[PDB]
Amino acid sequence: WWSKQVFEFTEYKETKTFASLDNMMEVLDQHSLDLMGMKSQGKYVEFFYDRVEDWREKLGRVDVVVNEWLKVQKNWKILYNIFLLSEDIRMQLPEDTKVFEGVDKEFKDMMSEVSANPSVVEACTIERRDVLVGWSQAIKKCEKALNDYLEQKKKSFPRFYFLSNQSLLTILSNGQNAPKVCEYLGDCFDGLKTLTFEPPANPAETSKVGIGMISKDDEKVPFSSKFICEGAVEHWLLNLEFRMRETLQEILEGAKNTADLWDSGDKPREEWVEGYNAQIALLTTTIVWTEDVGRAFEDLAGGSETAMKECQKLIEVRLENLIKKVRGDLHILERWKIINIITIDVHSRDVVEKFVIQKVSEAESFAWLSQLKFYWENKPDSDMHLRQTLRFPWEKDKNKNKCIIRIVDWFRFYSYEYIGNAIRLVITPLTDRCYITLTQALNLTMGGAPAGPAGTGKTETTKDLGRAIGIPVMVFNCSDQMNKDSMAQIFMGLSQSGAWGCFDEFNRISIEVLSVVSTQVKCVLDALKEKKTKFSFVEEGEIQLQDTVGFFITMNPGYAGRTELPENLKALFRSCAMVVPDLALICENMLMSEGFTMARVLSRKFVSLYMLSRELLSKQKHYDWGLRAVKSVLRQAGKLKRGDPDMPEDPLLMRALRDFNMPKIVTDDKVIFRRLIGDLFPKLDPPTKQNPELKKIVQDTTKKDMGLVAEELFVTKVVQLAEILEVRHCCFVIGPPGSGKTCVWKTLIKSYINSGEDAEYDTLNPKAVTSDELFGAYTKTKEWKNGVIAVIMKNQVKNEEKYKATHMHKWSVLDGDIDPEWIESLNTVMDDNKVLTLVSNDRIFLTPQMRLIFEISNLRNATPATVSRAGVLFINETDIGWMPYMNSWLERSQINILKQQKEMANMPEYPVIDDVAKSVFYRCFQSYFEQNIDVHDKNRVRHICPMVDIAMIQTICTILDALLIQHLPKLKQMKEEDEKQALEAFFIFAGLWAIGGPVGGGQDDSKDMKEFNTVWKGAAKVKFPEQGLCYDYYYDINENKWNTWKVEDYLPNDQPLFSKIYV
Amino acid sequence: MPYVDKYGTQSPIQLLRLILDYGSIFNREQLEERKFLQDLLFFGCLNQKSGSFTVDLRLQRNFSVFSMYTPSSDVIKTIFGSILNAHLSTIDDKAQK
Amino acid sequence: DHMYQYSLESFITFFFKAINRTTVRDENRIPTLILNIRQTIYQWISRGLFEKHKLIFLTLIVFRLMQKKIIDVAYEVAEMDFLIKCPARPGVENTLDWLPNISWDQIQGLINLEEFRNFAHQLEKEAPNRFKDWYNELQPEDQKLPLDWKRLDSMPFKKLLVLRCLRPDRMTISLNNFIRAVLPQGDAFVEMDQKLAFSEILESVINEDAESTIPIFFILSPGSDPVKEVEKIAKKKRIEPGKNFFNIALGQGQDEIARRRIEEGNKEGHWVMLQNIHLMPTWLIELEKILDSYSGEAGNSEFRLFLSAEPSTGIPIGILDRSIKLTNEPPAGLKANMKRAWTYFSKEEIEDKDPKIKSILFALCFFHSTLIERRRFGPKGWNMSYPFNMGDLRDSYLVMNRYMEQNQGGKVPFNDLIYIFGEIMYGGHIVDDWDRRLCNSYLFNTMHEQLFDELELFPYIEGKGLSFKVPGQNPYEKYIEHIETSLKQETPLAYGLHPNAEIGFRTDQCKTLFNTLLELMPKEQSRDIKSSNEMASDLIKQLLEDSELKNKIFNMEEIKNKIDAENKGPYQNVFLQEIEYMNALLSEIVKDLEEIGQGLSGLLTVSENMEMIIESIALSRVPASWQKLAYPSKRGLQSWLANLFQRIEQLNIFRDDPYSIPRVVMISRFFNPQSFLTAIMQVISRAKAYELNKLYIQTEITKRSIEEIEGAAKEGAYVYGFILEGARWDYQLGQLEESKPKEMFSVLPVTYCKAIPLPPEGKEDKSLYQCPVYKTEDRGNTYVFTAQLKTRFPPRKWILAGVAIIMDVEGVSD
Ligand SMILES: Nc1ncnc2c1ncn2[C@@H]1O[C@H](COP(=O)(O)OP(=O)(O)OP(=O)(O)O)[C@@H](O)[C@H]1O
Ligand SMILES: [Mg+2]
């Protein structure tokens, strides 16, 4: 292997490189392992050790040199790429740039010389290894010098500290190329993803002229004049950071002037909201809300009782008028620009309701001071220069109205950061209380920590507070890899630029590094109390301080591997208590999102149903009563609301809740749940809604080509499935072990074919195949094989039978038992976002016309979260029945169709059933199962395995089949009277045996047989002879005497093995 | 008797179900190929109180169940009595009883 | 408890030291040496132990001397097992009025002992003349019984046992008196090291022991600094300017400086104090290795290492062992807590502040003080343990301080300030929200317009005679002097609790000291003839097999077949769901029982969970797997089985005539009570014509007893088995009133539960009081629904008293 091994050079434009060395590397390591040990350990090997030891030393030498280029090439690649295409950064550090360029050219030459040499380790020798180590040390020095330069840049711009060093380096390298820089500002800022640009003079150059900014959701804010990108990357980005604010400030002055004008003005509120931006609109709503409330308090000091009731009335009319606007078709950006307003105007209405009920008639009551108030006033006696520090020009002007934000003795200016229409959380009495705690912490210049259980989303509340203020909010997540140095940089960066720091999973931090954080934070907090413009940190003392900065840490008491915070740190951070958000207040918003006028009253009713439903219904895993299920029920109700707005809300909601929950609910729970629904809307009468076109075509297709009886219960399930597939991309057809779950989805496809166009379906069993092999994994050799799921996803898009060309609806069927390990790989597809994740990292997007159908017996292995993710459908065994099989078997329509259109050529021919014979079998089947309680009684008949009703019928049919073919010629020769006895007899014999086999187990098998013998002995007109078991007798057509089974007297054989000898 | 996982469902058994209904088996080499299987029959032999007590009810539905009963005086005497009588008759005319 | 691990080696050095301290020269050396060892070892360990555990450890030493019979005491081995754990035995419904039902069930365990076999019948004879009189008398342990029980009262152990069973509260006090009599020079062991305080102990312990190689370990509680006391003592022993000795505080990066200091310290001979040792768990494993190397080297004489740390898990066992442990706990009392609150606040800040602001600060200090004293009470008190620090009180002052500086001459808003104190300042700690309403009561009572005028901080004080008021305007020094005099004696009544609520604490305190002492009790007497755990499990198994458990299980199919399912009711739905849960419990416990019963008498593999069930039966704790099933109510194993059969009895009467609901239902005996309440409302919603959501359940207390045959009253549902804690519901008055002093819990009569629509707006009624109901005495997230009842007193009084309803108190008849 080694005497002849090699390393091909792969050009990196322009350096030959060692790529794929690791494959050789691993083989070399394996040779070193066994080879070195065997020579010393082996006695024979000890004699010839003078050979193995020399070879082992050579193998050992190879590894050091091999690790050495890898440690240099990767790091050399990075530092070289910092120098590459950076004249700006080249001129800045000439001493190192030149030293580095020297090393790179040497490295490019040495690698070319090696591609001429054979084994790299043999070529490396020792002197070469020492030279490589020296070059690597020289390159490191360049990295250290570059790191110092980055810190100076980090001091200049606060956003750079938050940005990753790899991104930072990229931005500094491409300082000329503006559009590439603007790409990474999405990571720094809450909004402002990129910038719009004027097409340049020469097409080769990238644009500098910024006309507008683009949000993360593509909302455009146009700048007043052209924004030119100046030289230094930090210098033009800091001018941009200020130009964001300036432009938001400049529009608000226009927005508030037009805000007063729309009130009395002919132009509606809802139309004015459209014109302006989601952030500015929402602020200006809150501003004219506070003015409005302030005019209502001043009137009530006059004595007008109606002042509070009219302010209530007005706020409740705008809420309704806006609710109609979300219902009528809008643009998805305009949805939240309008729905975020719905979530603040609902709270506003709840505030004025609360003021009228408590009867608070004084301004500067706590109740008014408590609420987050927004004031647009040029206060001529400005205290704002004392309360915080004046930063921006407009704050210092004192001739133009500034935006101030007052709440319980904490007044700080609206900083104008751009958030770009991220969804505002639903306001609730807990979040109002939470805002009080955090604001008081800032008022006292100390940290504010909210502690709650998992799923509370406390981090999201603290973010949405800073969003209302318009200060930037940064989110940090700690995986216990955080160091003193890495943490210090964040705090240093955060202090430099006014920015709220929220720490996710702060609880899971090493008690060592935490005791630093406490000292670092203490030094900042100590500076804020002094209120000094500049302060001195432990290292890198001279840093710009800003009063507007605040530190928020989110602890989880219940989290596993929790570390107790030091008493010194606990005293600094004010603890707040956090509870799960009330299901009424979230549901109320979701209902107002879909445009229900009575949403409030319905929400309190809706939540109460679900809460009562969990308690009174039997605990089922397939039932989802979570918020995620509620939204998916409302979204369906919302489309139906938009269809018929003129219909009242309470009757519409009634019909929606019943329709969608009925399928999931079992028969035991269907009766109670229907009666439970009656409690909420007793006067309202629900009318069942069924699509007549879909129901007709399903019934017609099932008789024509499926050869199965279109039973009113069966067809209802198919229609219910078809609805679920339309709303929900992913669906679970759950059910009992023996039903027609498979037939229901199969019938739907053949109906879609008759309805529209042919619908390909790719059936697989996920549980059967190994979880790794199904999804597909890397082999020993560096090559990726396509998974069974993964290839169907490539095949269904194009270049296969399932290709999306002529097929309106395709869906891949899965019929395995759901598992948390197996579903975890598919959990990305389960979610609303149609994204597929693989080990190869090949990106596949699920089409809107693609669906997933899972078919499971028990959802016990599945997680409660997994049930929420998708739309469930339960099929009750009794509702389908076994009659439709029996009717399909007696008609032979099912069987006849399968023979006509299958690749199964070698299929046994089923006997022709006489009209007289059919009418006996039909009566006999029906008469023996319905009338006999004793047959289905657990006590009377003891089974070994829990056989399903359907399974026993399938065996009767297959036994009866063979008995007819053998005696078909005899049944025609016989008279109809003795034939009618003979066909009954055939059934009894077949029935006996079809339930006979399953009978067994217990202490004695004989006792369980005798019990079963007794009940079956009453087999209508036909009787069995006494002192014999029903099994021991078989019906003879010629004799008609039920002649007992004749056994052949054993014959001696010369077989040596005893197991071969058969009696 | 095939090893059951945490989840209480056997991977080798679940495969047989895919074969019985759909009649297509995905080969671990060339997973794109359907590899349809035809004119196949499967004859189960299941021992209770052994490994997994019960198999999946969706497979067990496709199979027609049958039971062998535990040994009986009348069953034993007819089986073994006929073996011994055929061998003891060759030994001696006596000692048949 | 963790960090109480003591080395063999350190114990051996203390044991030897005790021998060298003995000055007797073979006159009575062998006796006096034993006595000196006990004292020497006890005082070492006591320092290491917390205040609450110091009692527990002394109880062991005496019981272990008694077990081995080193000192002659009158006891029985069976009676010592009964003392450590008393099983409540049901069977006898007949009790005495004054005696609690729980006390009677403990007496039925006492009857099984041969010495107190005849005690049960003696008790019935002249009970009111003697036992009632004695029960009622305070310090009962000193009082002699007049029924010729003087012979039991001579023998201190046998007496001690009877005192627990009758009066749980006086056990902790009586035990101390028993300990003193039995143990030699026991009066010196009770006094212990209380006379020497703390500062004198620390000066003594450094000089007398741990000269070299044995580093000193400090365990500090919040608001206590070990460094301040050691530095004063350090200066007297040797010249300590801060150069010779270094008080190095452990921070990240300063681990190398501490390593250099300790390395330098050994060869130099100067002692080295390290603080916040718990803050670096990696460095303790490193430090351990350095101490082991230096113990083998043996650097310079008169060298020590002081280490101080908050108690925590993941501290190395090796360090905790080798090192002497010394605990410093601050004096525990309302007055002692109020004093510590004012000492925290800087003298020179309070003098500067005007009389108005310093007066309201005082009332806040009290408010902070009283919350720590409530934490000491479990259910009756908070219902939950929440951390409270001085920093959370300081925070609240700094906000208050600003509000007074803004208002100036204009009157200060309490309404503005009180919300902040309830929702923010001490809202942050409370998540449950039931404790928050209690938290606001204290606050609302303390903060009001009249506060600035002299006003009682303790609630109401109508005929209590404490007369403790907020001090009038005077100099700062005069505020503390008035605090110290006026608080004088600390009682439950001061916080707003009832006197019986303090007795109940000594009960809960007493119970914990014996549950710990059971674990600690070593070798299980070292055989001999007491019944084994597996025998005791077999005996309980036989009692369960004697009962028809397999018959008691209800087949779902039979019950469903009896119901038509067209005339079905909401009630019928709840029972069907309830009996299913019971079936699942009753099947599980019979499976676990018949499996463990087979494992005892049959050759089969014994699972780990089954060994735990056997262990749990001997202890007579409810099993963990069983506890998880059905109700979350903690009881004795024998009480649980008796309670379970009363649940089963309620389902048996359901099985016969299911359609006909029983005239009086018992909410005290359901799996979910809430589920039943949703049912009673459903039945009303059908009969009436409005939304179920709008209807709220409203309880009304009825004077009629169970005797009344009137049932299924239109817009109604009868209930019984409700029990009220911290108050008494008088039948004749028809209202809630202050509890009888000696009666701990007051059973409610037949409760009528009506459904009626909610008020359109939030309405506050003074007469109606909202008390929560809880399934268990613990009251920890077992809230079901808010019951309302009529009270002549203000509600504020009752929320402060903590008054709640409990379903199972073990004061249920028969
Ligand atoms: N309307 C009908 N009348 C009679 N038999 C029917 C009818 N519809 C379907 N069947 C038959 O009932 C059986 C249903 O098979 P299917 O695989 O759907 O059952 P399943 O128990 O849901 O299966 P799995 O456990 O694999 O999910 C098949 O024999 C099917 O042909
Ligand atoms: Mg199937």
3-state SS of C43-81 is HHHHHHCCHHHHHHHHHHHHHHHHHHCCCCCCCCHHHHH
Query: In which element (H, E) is residue A17 found?
Result: strand A16-18
Sequence-distant (≥ 6) Cβ neighbours of residue A640 within 8 angstroms: A652, A655, A656
Q: Which two tokens stand for residue A925?
A: 């089947």
**Gap between the Cα atoms of C433 and A581, Å rounded:** 14
B1 to A857, B18, B55, B70, C418: CA distances (angstroms): 22, 20, 10, 20, 70
A707 lines ligand 1 (CB under 6 A): no
Strand pairing partners for A553? Answer: A503
Sequence-distant (≥ 6) Cβ neighbours of residue A211 within 8 angstroms: A196, A197, A198, A222, A223, A226, A227
Instruction: Answer for the pair A498, A471: CB distance below 8 angstroms, yes or no.
Output: yes
Residues of A in contact with B71 (CB under 8 A): none
Provide the 10 A C-beta neighbour count for residue A708: 21
Q: Is A98 buried (19+), middle (13-18) or exposed (0-12) by CB count in 10 A? A: exposed
CA angle centred on A719, ends A717 and A721, rounded to 5°: 65
Provide the 10 A C-beta neighbour count for residue A383: 9
The answer, for B54 touching chain A at a CB cutoff of 8 Å, is yes
The answer, for C689 touching chain A at a CB cutoff of 8 Å, is yes
**Gap between the Cα atoms of A839 and A1034, Å rounded:** 61
B40 to B19, B20, B37: CA distances (angstroms): 9, 8, 7
Residue type, A272: W
**Gap between the Cα atoms of A138 and A131, Å rounded:** 11
The chains found to touch C (3+ Cβ pairs under 8 angstroms) are: A
Dihedrals φ, ψ of C786, to 5°? -85, 110
Q: Is C27 left (phi over 0), alpha (psi -120 to 50) or beta?
A: alpha
Rg, chain C, Cα only:
31
Closest CA to A937 of A986, A995, A886, A877: A995
Using CB atoms and an 8 Å cut-off, which of residues 919-958 of chain A contact chain B?
A: 944-948, 950-951, 954-955, 958
Dihedrals φ, ψ of A853, to 5°? -120, 115
Dihedrals φ, ψ of A268, to 5°? -60, 165
The answer, for A295 touching chain C at a CB cutoff of 8 Å, is no
Residue type, A481: Q
Residue C301 DSSP symbol: S
Residues of A in contact with B2 (CB under 8 A): none
**Gap between the Cα atoms of A155 and A545, Å rounded:** 11
Sheet of strand A220-227, all strands in order from the earlier edge strand to the far edge: A194-195, A210-214, A220-227
Closest CA to A664 of A871, A847, A874: A874
Q: Is C778 buried (19+), middle (13-18) or exposed (0-12) by CB count in 10 A? A: middle
Q: Is A803 buried (19+), middle (13-18) or exposed (0-12) by CB count in 10 A? A: middle
Give A612's Cβ-side CA count (13 Å radius).
27
Interface-testing mutation among A785, A941, A1050, with chain B (most B C-beta atoms within 10 A):
A1050
Provide the 10 A C-beta neighbour count for residue A902: 11
Sequence-distant (≥ 6) Cβ neighbours of residue A263 within 8 angstroms: A288
Nearest to A513 among C252, C278, C387 (CB): C252
Which residue is associated with the tokens 């009758």? C166
Nearest to A997 among B28, B58, B65 (CB): B65
Q: Which two tokens stand for residue A660?
A: 């969608």
**Gap between the Cα atoms of A27 and A21, Å rounded:** 10
A491 lines ligand 1 (CB under 6 A): no
Strand pairing partners for C218? Answer: C308, C326
**Gap between the Cα atoms of C584 and A430, Å rounded:** 39
Q: How far is C389 from chain A (nearest CA, A)?
A: 8
Q: What is the dihedral of CA C684, C688, C689, C694, to 10 degrees?
A: -40
Q: Mark yes or no for CB contact C692/A616 under 8 Å.
A: no
Using CB atoms and an 8 Å cut-off, which of residues 20-49 of chain B contact chain A?
A: 21-24, 26, 28, 31-32, 36, 38-39, 46, 48
Q: Which ligand is nearest to the CA of A857?
A: 1
Closest CA to C578 of C600, C558, C554, C596: C554
DSSP-derived 3-state class of residue C140: coil
Q: How far is A1002 from chain B (nearest CA, A)?
A: 11
Closest CA to C681 of A679, A669, A619, A671: A679
Q: Which residue of A has its CA nearest to B85?
A: A1052
Residue type, C301: S
Is the dihedral angle over the CA atoms A857, A861, A867, A869 positive or is it negative? Answer: negative
**Gap between the Cα atoms of A512 and C351, Å rounded:** 40
- Helix, strand, coil shares of chain C, percent, nearest 5, are 55, 10, 40
Q: Mark yes or no for CB contact A816/B26 under 8 Å.
A: no
Q: Which two tokens stand for residue A290?
A: 């506070």
A370 to A301, A351, B9, C528: CA distances (angstroms): 20, 11, 58, 73
Q: Tell me how the structure was determined.
A: cryo-EM
The answer, for A645 touching chain B at a CB cutoff of 8 Å, is no
Residue with CA closest to ligand 1 atom 24: B58
Strand pairing partners for C786? Answer: C772
Q: Mark yes or no for CB contact C420/A440 under 8 Å.
A: yes
Q: What is the largest CA-CA distance in chain B?
A: 72
**Gap between the Cα atoms of A210 and A227, Å rounded:** 5
Strand pairing partners for C697? Answer: C755
Q: Mark yes or no for CB contact A947/B31 under 8 Å.
A: no
The answer, for C416 touching chain A at a CB cutoff of 8 Å, is yes
Q: Which two tokens stand for residue A898?
A: 């399968």
Instruction: Answer for the pair C449, C414: CB distance below 8 angstroms, yes or no.
Output: yes
**Gap between the Cα atoms of A825 and C465, Å rounded:** 72
A709 lines ligand 1 (CB under 6 A): yes
